[PDB]
Amino acid sequence: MWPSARFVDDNVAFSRMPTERELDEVAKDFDAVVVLVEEYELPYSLEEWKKRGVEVLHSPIPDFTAPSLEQLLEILRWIEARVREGKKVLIHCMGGLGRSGTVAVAWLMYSKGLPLREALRRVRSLRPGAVETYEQMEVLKELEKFLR
């Protein structure tokens, strides 16, 4: 297993950016990748995944910012679609874990129904530093109100 990945359930993990020499290593374990950074901050083309047969959701979120609620729900629905087909999904931004940690917390909330306080504690137990900003916290609170 690519040891930088941390799983929040059997099928969904989050990590830092894989480097180019790690792409086969990721493709072996993950059939889908959610890429939360703009192309300009990547050191390879996302075509690298296509030639490996790995499905890609490219949904950029600017550095240190939160996704909109609609963007977050689109990402969650896509992750659910892949998990329903039995694939494993890797979520990543850069090296920080604000954006990727936000999606990981949201996934526990969306897929398991965990309350925000428990989903947050769980993901921060995996990587202290998941969910960096007040705005990232606020979109998670909006997600909770949407789910109920």
Author numbering: 1 to 148
What does the publication say?
We present here an engineered chimeric PTP (ShufPTP) generated by shuffling the amino acid sequence of five extant hyperthermophilic archaeal PTPs. Despite ShufPTP’s high sequence similarity to its natural counterparts, ShufPTP presents a suite of unique properties, including high flexibility of the phosphate binding P-loop, facile oxidation of the active site cysteine, mechanistic promiscuity, and most notably, hyperthermostability, with a denaturation temperature likely >130 °C (>8°C higher than the highest recorded growth temperature of any archaeal strain). In each case, ShufPTP adopts a canonical architecture characteristic of the protein tyrosine phosphatase family, with particularly close structural similarity to its archaeal relatives TkPTP (RMSD 1.1 Å) and SsoPTP (RMSD 2.4 Å). The enzyme contains all four signature catalytic motifs that define modern PTPs: the phosphate-binding P-loop with conserved (H/V)CX5R(S/T) motif, the Q-loop that carries the water-directing glutamine, the IPD-loop that carries the conserved general acid (an aspartic acid), and the E-loop that carries a possible alternate general acid candidate (a glutamic acid).
The most striking difference between the ShufPTP structures is in the P-loop. We observe three distinct P-loop backbone conformations, which we designate “low,” “intermediate,” or “high,” referring to the relative position of the loop to the substrate binding site within the active site. Remarkably, the oxidation states of the catalytic nucleophile, C93 differ depending on the structure, often with multiple oxidation states observed in a single structure. Specifically, we observe the cysteine as: (1) a sulfenic acid, (2) a sulfonic acid, and (3) a rare cyclic five-membered sulfenamide ring. The relationship between the P-loop conformation and the oxidation state of C93 is unclear, in part because multiple oxidation states are often observed in a single structure. In contrast, the phosphate binding loop of ShufPTP is highly mobile, taking on at least three distinct stable conformations, a feature that is highly uncommon in P-loop containing enzymes more broadly, given that phosphate binding P-loops tend to be structurally rigid and follow narrowly defined geometric parameters. Mechanistically, the active site cysteine of ShufPTP is readily amenable to oxidation, a feature that has emerged to be an important regulatory mechanism that links cellular tyrosine phosphorylation with signaling by reactive oxygen or nitrogen species. ShufPTP exhibits a higher oxidation rate than any of the previously reported values for PTPs, with a kinact of 65 ± 5 M−1 s−1.
